Amino acid sequence: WRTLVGVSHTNEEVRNMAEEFEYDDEPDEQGNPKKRPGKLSDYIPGPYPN
Amino acid sequence: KSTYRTPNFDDVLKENNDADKGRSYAYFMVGAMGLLSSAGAKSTVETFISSMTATADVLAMA
Ligand SMILES: CCCCCCCCCCCCCCC(=O)O[C@H](COC(=O)CCCCCCCCCCCC)COP(=O)(O)O
Ligand SMILES: CCCCCCCCCCCCCCC(=O)O[C@H](COC(=O)CCCCCCCCCCCC)COP(=O)(O)O
């Protein structure tokens, strides 16, 4: 996501685009998995799981 | 014929020798080559050395 900044979109435009997808997070203190919205370090996600 | 007779060198000799002008133009071209070769070798080493600094994905987690 970070590679689009300064090429086609501004910095706050890409932050809003990546925040419409959810990614895997580290598990909580009991060990159950969580989710989180996206950030500029993430890669653009695809439509299929496998 | 006699070895004291020097053969004809006139189609390559300058009309005025003028030793201060012939040494000055040859040392301008050799000096310009060492100037550009040193600036070229310096940027070459800095291209290879800077490839060992932190990559773009490492800096994004700073
Ligand atoms: C292994 C086969 C040879 C491949 C060629 C490798 C070239 C690297 C050797 C450098 C050649 C010049 C030697 C300089 C020298 O000691 O002459 C010095 C003279 O140096 C000077 O007076 C001015 C410096 C010359 C600048 C030449 C720029 C060339 C920069 C190299 C370009 C990148 C490779 C002694 O030579 P002389 O006895 O004729 O005076
Ligand atoms: C060992 C590598 C030798 C490369 C052979 C030349 C092939 C051309 C590719 C050059 C890629 C690296 C430079 C890229 C670059 O951005 O540089 C450019 C252009 O400058 C040059 O490097 C051209 C000179 C090439 C060397 C001339 C002889 C120097 C003596 C030998 C050097 C060994 C110590 C500088 O731009 P920059 O400073 O913004 O990075």
Closest Cα to atom 29, ligand 1: which residue?
Answer: B34
The CA distance from A13 to A2, in Å, is 11
Do A14 and A2 touch, CB atoms closer than 8 A?
yes
Do A25 and A38 touch, CB atoms closer than 8 A? no
CATH superfamily ID and name for B1-55: Ubiquinol cytochrome reductase, transmembrane domain (1.20.5.270)
Resolution in A: 2.3
- Neighbouring CB atoms inside 10 A of A39's CB total 14
Query: Burial of B24 by CB count in 10 Å (0-12 exposed, 13-18 middle, 19+ buried)?
Result: exposed
- Give residue B16 CA to ligand 1 midpoint distance, Å: 30
Phi and psi at residue B34, to the nearest 5°: -70, -25
Amino acid found at A20: E
Tokens in use for B41? 């070798």
Q: Say which amino acid occupies B24.
A: S
The continuous run of DSSP H or E covering A16 comes out as helix A11-18
The residue nearest atom 27 of ligand 2, judged by CA position, is: B40
Three-state helix/strand/coil letters over chain B: CCCCCCCCCCCCCCCCCCHHHHHHHHHHHHHHHHHHHHHHHHHHHHHHHHHHCCCHHHHCCC
Technique employed here was: cryo-EM
Ligand number with the minimum distance to the CA of B27: 1
Q: How far is B62 from chain A (nearest CA, A)?
A: 11
